[PDB]
Structure formats: structure tokens, C-alpha cells
PDB file of C-alpha atoms and ligand atoms in Angstrom:
ATOM      1  CA  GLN A   1      28.563  56.564 -17.882  1.00 22.43           C
ATOM      2  CA  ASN A   2      30.334  57.774 -21.008  1.00 22.83           C
ATOM      3  CA  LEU A   3      33.416  55.561 -21.382  1.00 18.56           C
ATOM      4  CA  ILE A   4      35.157  58.076 -23.682  1.00 19.64           C
ATOM      5  CA  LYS A   5      37.379  60.684 -21.994  1.00 20.30           C
ATOM      6  CA  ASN A   6      37.919  64.293 -23.181  1.00 21.09           C
ATOM      7  CA  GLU A   7      34.664  63.739 -25.030  1.00 23.67           C
ATOM      8  CA  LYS A   8      34.234  67.295 -26.233  1.00 23.73           C
ATOM      9  CA  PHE A   9      37.909  67.917 -27.053  1.00 22.10           C
ATOM     10  CA  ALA A  10      38.036  70.642 -24.429  1.00 18.97           C
ATOM     11  CA  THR A  11      41.666  69.598 -23.884  1.00 22.97           C
ATOM     12  CA  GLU A  12      43.863  70.007 -26.980  1.00 22.65           C
ATOM     13  CA  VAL A  13      44.825  66.712 -28.644  1.00 22.75           C
ATOM     14  CA  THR A  14      48.248  66.467 -30.296  1.00 20.72           C
ATOM     15  CA  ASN A  15      49.498  62.995 -29.338  1.00 20.71           C
ATOM     16  CA  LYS A  16      50.379  60.918 -32.330  1.00 19.91           C
ATOM     17  CA  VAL A  17      51.217  57.229 -32.212  1.00 19.94           C
ATOM     18  CA  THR A  18      52.511  54.927 -34.928  1.00 21.68           C
ATOM     19  CA  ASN A  19      50.506  51.965 -33.601  1.00 21.56           C
ATOM     20  CA  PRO A  20      47.512  51.889 -31.226  1.00 22.54           C
ATOM     21  CA  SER A  21      49.452  49.420 -29.024  1.00 19.66           C
ATOM     22  CA  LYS A  22      51.579  52.393 -27.917  1.00 19.90           C
ATOM     23  CA  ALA A  23      48.674  54.700 -27.145  1.00 20.14           C
ATOM     24  CA  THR A  24      47.936  55.741 -23.563  1.00 21.50           C
ATOM     25  CA  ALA A  25      44.407  54.667 -22.714  1.00 23.44           C
ATOM     26  CA  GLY A  26      41.748  57.177 -21.824  1.00 25.19           C
ATOM     27  CA  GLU A  27      43.156  59.846 -24.119  1.00 23.27           C
ATOM     28  CA  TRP A  28      42.666  60.588 -27.801  1.00 25.79           C
ATOM     29  CA  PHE A  29      45.428  59.682 -30.205  1.00 25.24           C
ATOM     30  CA  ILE A  30      46.125  60.582 -33.801  1.00 23.94           C
ATOM     31  CA  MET A  31      46.977  57.785 -36.225  1.00 23.11           C
ATOM     32  CA  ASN A  32      48.394  59.065 -39.502  1.00 23.99           C
ATOM     33  CA  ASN A  33      50.574  56.493 -41.196  1.00 23.12           C
ATOM     34  CA  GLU A  34      49.497  57.633 -44.644  1.00 22.65           C
ATOM     35  CA  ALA A  35      52.320  59.076 -46.728  1.00 26.08           C
ATOM     36  CA  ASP A  36      53.464  62.577 -45.861  1.00 27.56           C
ATOM     37  CA  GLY A  37      51.028  65.081 -47.347  1.00 29.27           C
ATOM     38  CA  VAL A  38      48.017  62.774 -47.791  1.00 28.76           C
ATOM     39  CA  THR A  39      45.951  63.800 -44.756  1.00 29.53           C
ATOM     40  CA  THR A  40      46.160  66.015 -41.690  1.00 28.88           C
ATOM     41  CA  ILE A  41      44.317  65.172 -38.485  1.00 30.83           C
ATOM     42  CA  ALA A  42      44.404  67.975 -35.934  1.00 29.03           C
ATOM     43  CA  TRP A  43      42.611  69.653 -33.048  1.00 28.22           C
ATOM     44  CA  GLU A  44      40.799  72.923 -33.686  1.00 27.54           C
ATOM     45  CA  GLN A  45      38.577  75.522 -32.098  1.00 26.13           C
ATOM     46  CA  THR A  46      35.607  75.809 -34.428  1.00 24.49           C
ATOM     47  CA  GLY A  47      33.914  79.099 -33.532  1.00 22.25           C
ATOM     48  CA  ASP A  48      30.618  77.182 -33.118  1.00 21.82           C
ATOM     49  CA  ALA A  49      29.251  77.695 -29.606  1.00 22.91           C
ATOM     50  CA  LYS A  50      27.419  74.362 -29.645  1.00 21.34           C
ATOM     51  CA  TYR A  51      30.624  72.388 -30.604  1.00 20.30           C
ATOM     52  CA  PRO A  52      33.464  74.757 -29.819  1.00 16.05           C
ATOM     53  CA  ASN A  53      36.339  72.246 -30.070  1.00 17.64           C
ATOM     54  CA  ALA A  54      36.722  69.409 -32.591  1.00 22.25           C
ATOM     55  CA  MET A  55      39.112  67.170 -34.458  1.00 22.62           C
ATOM     56  CA  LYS A  56      39.448  67.814 -38.199  1.00 19.82           C
ATOM     57  CA  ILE A  57      40.328  65.002 -40.613  1.00 21.84           C
ATOM     58  CA  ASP A  58      41.466  66.853 -43.735  1.00 22.21           C
ATOM     59  CA  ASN A  59      42.010  64.690 -46.836  1.00 22.39           C
ATOM     60  CA  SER A  60      42.640  67.638 -49.181  1.00 25.12           C
ATOM     61  CA  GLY A  61      46.101  66.221 -49.972  1.00 25.30           C
ATOM     62  CA  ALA A  62      44.875  62.742 -50.842  1.00 22.11           C
ATOM     63  CA  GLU A  63      45.154  61.149 -54.323  1.00 23.18           C
ATOM     64  CA  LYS A  64      43.259  58.061 -53.115  1.00 24.50           C
ATOM     65  CA  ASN A  65      40.948  57.179 -50.222  1.00 26.50           C
ATOM     66  CA  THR A  66      42.822  56.629 -46.989  1.00 27.43           C
ATOM     67  CA  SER A  67      43.354  53.219 -45.415  1.00 28.69           C
ATOM     68  CA  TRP A  68      41.258  52.007 -42.482  1.00 27.53           C
ATOM     69  CA  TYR A  69      44.374  50.982 -40.557  1.00 23.00           C
ATOM     70  CA  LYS A  70      46.518  54.053 -41.342  1.00 22.96           C
ATOM     71  CA  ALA A  71      44.578  57.286 -40.655  1.00 20.28           C
ATOM     72  CA  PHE A  72      42.037  57.780 -37.884  1.00 17.50           C
ATOM     73  CA  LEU A  73      41.180  59.425 -34.583  1.00 19.46           C
ATOM     74  CA  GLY A  74      41.456  56.832 -31.851  1.00 18.76           C
ATOM     75  CA  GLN A  75      40.847  56.222 -28.154  1.00 18.75           C
ATOM     76  CA  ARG A  76      42.033  53.109 -26.355  1.00 16.93           C
ATOM     77  CA  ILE A  77      39.786  51.697 -23.653  1.00 16.05           C
ATOM     78  CA  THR A  78      41.151  49.482 -20.861  1.00 14.82           C
ATOM     79  CA  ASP A  79      38.396  49.867 -18.277  1.00 15.94           C
ATOM     80  CA  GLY A  80      37.039  46.396 -19.135  1.00 16.21           C
ATOM     81  CA  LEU A  81      33.888  46.156 -21.264  1.00 16.65           C
ATOM     82  CA  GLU A  82      30.961  43.809 -20.659  1.00 15.28           C
ATOM     83  CA  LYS A  83      29.400  41.458 -23.183  1.00 14.15           C
ATOM     84  CA  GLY A  84      26.366  43.611 -23.964  1.00 12.91           C
ATOM     85  CA  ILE A  85      25.187  46.326 -26.344  1.00 15.17           C
ATOM     86  CA  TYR A  86      26.790  49.762 -26.577  1.00 16.93           C
ATOM     87  CA  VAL A  87      25.994  52.928 -28.490  1.00 17.07           C
ATOM     88  CA  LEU A  88      28.618  55.156 -30.019  1.00 16.99           C
ATOM     89  CA  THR A  89      27.406  58.705 -30.797  1.00 18.45           C
ATOM     90  CA  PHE A  90      29.129  61.843 -31.999  1.00 18.97           C
ATOM     91  CA  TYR A  91      28.575  64.923 -34.118  1.00 19.75           C
ATOM     92  CA  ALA A  92      30.259  65.451 -37.476  1.00 20.31           C
ATOM     93  CA  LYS A  93      30.495  68.264 -40.010  1.00 17.88           C
ATOM     94  CA  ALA A  94      31.611  67.850 -43.656  1.00 17.65           C
ATOM     95  CA  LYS A  95      32.862  70.383 -46.193  1.00 17.81           C
ATOM     96  CA  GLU A  96      30.966  68.591 -49.013  1.00 16.63           C
ATOM     97  CA  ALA A  97      27.446  67.117 -48.919  1.00 16.79           C
ATOM     98  CA  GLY A  98      27.513  63.300 -49.004  1.00 19.88           C
ATOM     99  CA  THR A  99      30.905  62.843 -47.327  1.00 19.43           C
ATOM    100  CA  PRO A 100      31.000  59.689 -45.202  1.00 18.07           C
ATOM    101  CA  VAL A 101      32.212  59.353 -41.655  1.00 19.27           C
ATOM    102  CA  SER A 102      33.022  55.969 -40.208  1.00 19.42           C
ATOM    103  CA  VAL A 103      33.644  53.954 -37.065  1.00 22.66           C
ATOM    104  CA  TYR A 104      35.081  50.621 -35.960  1.00 23.84           C
ATOM    105  CA  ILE A 105      36.115  49.194 -32.567  1.00 23.43           C
ATOM    106  CA  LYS A 106      39.134  46.882 -32.685  1.00 25.80           C
ATOM    107  CA  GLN A 107      41.283  44.757 -30.408  1.00 25.91           C
ATOM    108  CA  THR A 108      44.505  46.598 -29.509  1.00 28.44           C
ATOM    109  CA  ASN A 109      46.979  43.727 -29.198  1.00 28.98           C
ATOM    110  CA  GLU A 110      46.276  40.919 -31.668  1.00 29.49           C
ATOM    111  CA  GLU A 111      47.759  37.473 -31.882  1.00 30.13           C
ATOM    112  CA  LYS A 112      48.960  35.862 -35.098  1.00 30.27           C
ATOM    113  CA  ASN A 113      47.123  32.946 -36.702  1.00 31.95           C
ATOM    114  CA  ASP A 114      48.596  29.550 -37.642  1.00 32.16           C
ATOM    115  CA  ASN A 115      49.677  31.010 -41.031  1.00 33.88           C
ATOM    116  CA  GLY A 116      51.654  33.953 -39.477  1.00 37.16           C
ATOM    117  CA  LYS A 117      49.269  36.847 -40.260  1.00 33.87           C
ATOM    118  CA  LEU A 118      48.010  39.177 -37.502  1.00 32.62           C
ATOM    119  CA  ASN A 119      44.388  38.628 -36.541  1.00 30.82           C
ATOM    120  CA  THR A 120      41.950  41.504 -37.009  1.00 29.60           C
ATOM    121  CA  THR A 121      39.270  41.284 -34.312  1.00 31.62           C
ATOM    122  CA  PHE A 122      36.388  43.775 -34.170  1.00 33.33           C
ATOM    123  CA  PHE A 123      33.131  44.149 -32.273  1.00 31.24           C
ATOM    124  CA  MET A 124      30.176  43.535 -34.583  1.00 29.97           C
ATOM    125  CA  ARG A 125      27.965  46.396 -35.551  1.00 32.37           C
ATOM    126  CA  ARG A 126      24.583  45.393 -34.202  1.00 32.83           C
ATOM    127  CA  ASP A 127      22.683  45.702 -37.473  1.00 32.18           C
ATOM    128  CA  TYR A 128      25.115  43.462 -39.387  1.00 33.25           C
ATOM    129  CA  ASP A 129      23.534  40.565 -41.255  1.00 35.36           C
ATOM    130  CA  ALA A 130      25.988  38.770 -43.585  1.00 35.40           C
ATOM    131  CA  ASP A 131      23.192  37.130 -45.549  1.00 33.00           C
ATOM    132  CA  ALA A 132      21.265  40.367 -46.192  1.00 33.21           C
ATOM    133  CA  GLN A 133      24.401  42.540 -46.557  1.00 31.23           C
ATOM    134  CA  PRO A 134      26.871  40.451 -48.546  1.00 28.68           C
ATOM    135  CA  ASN A 135      28.918  43.482 -49.593  1.00 26.49           C
ATOM    136  CA  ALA A 136      29.029  45.340 -46.282  1.00 23.58           C
ATOM    137  CA  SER A 137      31.580  45.293 -43.478  1.00 21.74           C
ATOM    138  CA  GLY A 138      30.420  43.679 -40.262  1.00 22.90           C
ATOM    139  CA  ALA A 139      32.923  45.812 -38.315  1.00 22.96           C
ATOM    140  CA  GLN A 140      32.989  49.239 -39.891  1.00 23.00           C
ATOM    141  CA  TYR A 141      29.962  51.517 -39.877  1.00 21.63           C
ATOM    142  CA  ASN A 142      29.711  54.298 -42.464  1.00 19.06           C
ATOM    143  CA  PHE A 143      27.287  57.218 -42.440  1.00 20.05           C
ATOM    144  CA  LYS A 144      26.832  59.778 -45.187  1.00 20.80           C
ATOM    145  CA  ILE A 145      26.685  63.323 -43.894  1.00 19.78           C
ATOM    146  CA  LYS A 146      23.853  64.645 -45.996  1.00 20.08           C
ATOM    147  CA  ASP A 147      24.430  68.408 -45.803  1.00 21.95           C
ATOM    148  CA  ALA A 148      27.594  70.505 -46.002  1.00 24.42           C
ATOM    149  CA  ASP A 149      28.684  72.718 -43.131  1.00 23.60           C
ATOM    150  CA  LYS A 150      26.142  71.349 -40.681  1.00 24.62           C
ATOM    151  CA  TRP A 151      26.807  69.505 -37.413  1.00 26.49           C
ATOM    152  CA  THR A 152      25.088  66.133 -37.785  1.00 26.94           C
ATOM    153  CA  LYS A 153      24.444  63.382 -35.253  1.00 28.08           C
ATOM    154  CA  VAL A 154      26.138  60.068 -35.979  1.00 26.79           C
ATOM    155  CA  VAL A 155      24.791  57.022 -34.058  1.00 27.91           C
ATOM    156  CA  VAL A 156      25.713  53.354 -34.230  1.00 26.74           C
ATOM    157  CA  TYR A 157      25.068  50.388 -31.949  1.00 26.69           C
ATOM    158  CA  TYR A 158      27.644  47.694 -31.425  1.00 29.20           C
ATOM    159  CA  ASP A 159      27.279  44.258 -29.829  1.00 29.00           C
ATOM    160  CA  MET A 160      30.297  43.693 -27.596  1.00 26.05           C
ATOM    161  CA  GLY A 161      28.949  40.158 -27.244  1.00 28.71           C
ATOM    162  CA  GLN A 162      29.848  39.386 -30.881  1.00 28.15           C
ATOM    163  CA  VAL A 163      33.074  39.730 -32.797  1.00 27.57           C
ATOM    164  CA  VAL A 164      33.988  39.539 -36.452  1.00 29.56           C
ATOM    165  CA  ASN A 165      37.407  38.353 -37.675  1.00 36.77           C
ATOM    166  CA  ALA A 166      37.755  40.821 -40.574  1.00 40.58           C
ATOM    167  CA  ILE A 167      36.721  44.239 -41.778  1.00 39.52           C
ATOM    168  CA  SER A 168      36.002  42.917 -45.261  1.00 39.31           C
ATOM    169  CA  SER A 169      32.646  41.912 -46.701  1.00 39.19           C
ATOM    170  CA  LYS A 170      31.378  38.356 -46.582  1.00 36.55           C
ATOM    171  CA  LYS A 171      31.217  38.120 -50.413  1.00 36.18           C
ATOM    172  CA  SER A 172      34.871  39.096 -50.657  1.00 33.41           C
ATOM    173  CA  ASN A 173      36.034  36.809 -47.830  1.00 30.63           C
ATOM    174  CA  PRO A 174      35.092  33.129 -47.472  1.00 29.43           C
ATOM    175  CA  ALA A 175      37.056  33.076 -44.201  1.00 29.50           C
ATOM    176  CA  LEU A 176      34.894  35.750 -42.518  1.00 28.79           C
ATOM    177  CA  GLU A 177      33.452  34.556 -39.189  1.00 28.81           C
ATOM    178  CA  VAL A 178      31.093  36.109 -36.684  1.00 28.53           C
ATOM    179  CA  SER A 179      31.337  34.543 -33.233  1.00 27.06           C
ATOM    180  CA  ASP A 180      30.161  35.110 -29.699  1.00 25.53           C
ATOM    181  CA  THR A 181      32.767  37.003 -27.671  1.00 24.88           C
ATOM    182  CA  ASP A 182      34.382  34.803 -25.042  1.00 27.71           C
ATOM    183  CA  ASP A 183      33.873  36.020 -21.479  1.00 25.90           C
ATOM    184  CA  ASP A 184      37.680  36.287 -21.202  1.00 21.81           C
ATOM    185  CA  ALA A 185      38.335  37.761 -24.636  1.00 22.65           C
ATOM    186  CA  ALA A 186      41.277  40.122 -24.876  1.00 18.92           C
ATOM    187  CA  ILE A 187      39.225  42.626 -26.876  1.00 21.06           C
ATOM    188  CA  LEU A 188      36.968  43.334 -23.886  1.00 21.29           C
ATOM    189  CA  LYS A 189      39.975  44.367 -21.760  1.00 22.42           C
ATOM    190  CA  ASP A 190      41.919  46.353 -24.378  1.00 22.92           C
ATOM    191  CA  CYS A 191      40.398  47.799 -27.524  1.00 24.84           C
ATOM    192  CA  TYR A 192      40.135  51.137 -29.284  1.00 24.98           C
ATOM    193  CA  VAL A 193      37.475  53.175 -30.973  1.00 27.49           C
ATOM    194  CA  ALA A 194      38.524  54.479 -34.422  1.00 25.02           C
ATOM    195  CA  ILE A 195      36.673  57.365 -36.079  1.00 24.92           C
ATOM    196  CA  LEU A 196      37.591  57.885 -39.761  1.00 25.10           C
ATOM    197  CA  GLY A 197      36.763  59.908 -42.834  1.00 27.90           C
ATOM    198  CA  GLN A 198      38.461  58.087 -45.679  1.00 29.94           C
ATOM    199  CA  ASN A 199      37.173  59.766 -48.816  1.00 28.10           C
ATOM    200  CA  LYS A 200      39.749  61.474 -51.043  1.00 30.94           C
ATOM    201  CA  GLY A 201      39.427  65.273 -50.871  1.00 32.09           C
ATOM    202  CA  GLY A 202      36.924  65.263 -48.016  1.00 32.27           C
ATOM    203  CA  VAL A 203      37.149  67.218 -44.804  1.00 35.55           C
ATOM    204  CA  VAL A 204      35.278  65.934 -41.723  1.00 29.60           C
ATOM    205  CA  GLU A 205      35.167  67.493 -38.252  1.00 30.15           C
ATOM    206  CA  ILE A 206      34.283  65.456 -35.174  1.00 28.25           C
ATOM    207  CA  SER A 207      33.025  66.546 -31.778  1.00 29.60           C
ATOM    208  CA  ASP A 208      31.143  65.382 -28.623  1.00 29.46           C
ATOM    209  CA  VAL A 209      31.724  61.648 -28.580  1.00 32.76           C
ATOM    210  CA  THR A 210      29.865  59.184 -26.350  1.00 37.63           C
ATOM    211  CA  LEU A 211      30.277  55.429 -25.833  1.00 39.37           C
ATOM    212  CA  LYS A 212      27.671  54.026 -23.418  1.00 41.30           C
ATOM    213  CA  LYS A 213      26.332  50.648 -22.406  1.00 39.96           C
ATOM    214  CA  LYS A 214      22.628  50.295 -23.229  1.00 40.39           C
TER     215      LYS A 214
HETATM  216 NA1   NA B 301      49.290  66.098 -43.423  1.00 39.73          NA
END
């Protein structure tokens, strides 16, 4: 089954939270902790019969790319995931050719480490290889939308059986660790999908989202 609810945005989404820990599971939420005026994330009816409702992430107001932890479309999942492989799929439309759209799947309620900083725990994108991809995130997947004004399939596999302890690249972060997810890991019981379009000036629309065990 699709684990994402309101997958085609047939129900209007307006709920904003200031932290995913406050989001009601099984619903979409809007995270926009960027400064007032930087981005607008909102529900829309598109006029396109194939994707008639969508979320629009509009970075027209941005002077800089937006932050991974500040501005995104999210959905918290508390149904209890299995250690296994999952596919996340959706359709996206960009105002400008080449605009990226992005994904990560993060633990909702993190503990702090010995040094007082919140952990950042993510499921590993399945194709991550730290040796071959020293400059890439192991958590966040990015896909360039090649054409403007065209609904485009976005597909990424995640391994819920592996986690990474940072969103940063291996080269940038000697503390980065990939590990096997514990059977009792908190992330399996309470996580959220984040869909983002961070580029300054870009406008990305999102519709028809699926998360499925494969
Ligand atoms: Na705004």
C-alpha cells in the first residue's frame, strides 16, 4: 500500500508547523521557517487534468537557497516501517529548466549526543556510496527537472535498513557514519518525508506522491 495519505492533494493543505515534532501524522504539513518573504509553500489547483491539485514551493522571494531544515513539504509517518527497501515517487513541474527537486526521510524526535547537539538521523538513499560519491549527501536525493512547465516523474529508493547520521557529504564530515538500522530504532516508528526545492528563484510544483515497500 501507499503509506502517504492525501497523496494527490485532493484535500486542501494549509497546516503549518514550526517543527515536525508538532505535526499530526498522516497529513501533509508546511514547514516554512525561512525569513518572512523568502518562500511561499501553498496548495493550488493547477488546471491540469492529469495532476489537478498540487503543492507549490515558490522561491521567487529568495536571496539565497533555502535551508534543508527550514522550508519543505512534509508528512509524518507513525504506522511503523520495516527494515527493508522503499520507493518514493512523485511528479514535479518547474518554472525553469534544470531546477532541482529533493527528498529526505528523517527521524522526527531526535536525542542529543554526548556533546549536547541534536542528532540528525536519516534513512540512507539506496544508491549512496561514500567512497564513490565523496561530495554527495547520503540522506538527501536531488533530481534536476530537465524541462520547464512539464510534469516529470521523480523516483528514489531508500533503504530503511540503513541510516546515516548527517545530511552532509563524507568529504566535508569525518564524523559521518552509515549504520544498519536497529530493529527497535525510533526512526522506524516516527519519521517524516520532506520534499524540497531549495534553489533561489525557482518554483516547483509537487503532486501524486507514493511511498511503498518494495
Ligand atoms: Na512567503
